[PDB]
Amino acid sequence: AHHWGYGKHNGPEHWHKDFPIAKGERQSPVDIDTHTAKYDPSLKPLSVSYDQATSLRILNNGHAFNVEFDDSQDKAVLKGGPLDGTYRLIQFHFHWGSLDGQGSEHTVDKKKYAAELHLVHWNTKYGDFGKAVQQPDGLAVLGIFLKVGSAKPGLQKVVDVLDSIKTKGKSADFTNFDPRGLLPESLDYWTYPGSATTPPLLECVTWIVLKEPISVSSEQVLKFRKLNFNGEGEPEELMVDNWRPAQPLKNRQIKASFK
Ligand SMILES: NS(=O)(=O)c1nc2ccccc2s1
Numbered sequence: 001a002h003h004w005g006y007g008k009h010n011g012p013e014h015w016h017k018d019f020p021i022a023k024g025e026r027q028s029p030v031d032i033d034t035h036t037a038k039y040d041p042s043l044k045p046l047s048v049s050y051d052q053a054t055s056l057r058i059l060n061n062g063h064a065f066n067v068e069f070d071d072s073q074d075k076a077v078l079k080g081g082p083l084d085g086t087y088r089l090i091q092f093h094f095h096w097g098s099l100d101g102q103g104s105e106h107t108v109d110k111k112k113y114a115a116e117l118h119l120v121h122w123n124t125k126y127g128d129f130g131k132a133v134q135q136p137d138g139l140a141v142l143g144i145f146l147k148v149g150s151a152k153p154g155l156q157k158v159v160d161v162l163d164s165i166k167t168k169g170k171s172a173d174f175t176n177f178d179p180r181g182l183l184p185e186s187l188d189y190w191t192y193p194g195s196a197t198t199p200p201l202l203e204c205v206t207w208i209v210l211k212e213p214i215s216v217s218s219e220q221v222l223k224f225r226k227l228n229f230n231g232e233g234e235p236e237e238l239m240v241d242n243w244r245p246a247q248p249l250k251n252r253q254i255k256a257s258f259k
């Protein structure tokens with residue numbers, strides 16, 4: 001079974017041994033060089049339709065926590081932008097640092113943000129998530145940077161439940177959470193073809209990374225950093241620095257939706 005992580009012996013630099021696609025041609029995340037990203041006037045506005053999103057549960061999976069959604073019909077969908085077709089929200093999660101100066105997976109002109117939110121959606125033309133991840137256009141991940149400043153009121157419900165899912169394998173009911181409260185004002189974005197950022201690192205993702213970060217408070221992110229990678233009763237390993245660093249861009253172009 002999987003033994004990868006973000007510790008001292010099993011971290012990103014080791015993943016390729018079990019998952020050789022780690023050294024593939026379309027791996028994520030990447031550094032976004034803002035000057036080299038070309039404005040593409042053919043890119044459409046992003047359609048984020050979360051009005052009917054139905055959250056169910058929050059889970060500490062040992063590498064992050066996932067806020068899970070009922071994806072058994074088109075309730076919360078992403079379309080437009082660079083996408084063809086309709087992509088259904090399945091879960092969101094975050095990556096964050098041990099300090100505010102790191103935590104994001106994507107970087108912007110080498111800048112690291114304190115954290116990064118990933119809203120994961122699967123292409124409905126493939127019928128289920130597990131089939132979608134086997135396709136080059138199977139997933140669309142909306143990435144949103146977090147900076148530390150003013151609190152995000154829409155995040156507080158998430159923060160407050162974390163004490164109940166401290167350790168790996170714990171979950172809690174988490175209904176009625178509205179992901180719209182995690183979105184910045186602007187939907188300007190960068191897009192490129194890439195991969196999942198955790199094993200198995202499948203090359204199935206159209207990345208949509210919003211330019212505008214959301215602000216969260218230092219107290220909010222401090223509570224992320226109280227989570228544990230370990231299971232109950234095991235030696236405490238704080239869940240921090242659960243980010244994969246930037247990977248080679250290779251033969252890819254990053255496009256901008258904005259001038
Ligand atoms: N961190 S992320 O790319 O949003 C992501 N990682 C994974 C791993 C397995 C399946 C899907 C995804 S989507």
Ligand SMILES: [Zn+2]
Binds near residue numbers: 093094095118197
């Ligand atoms: Zn992620």
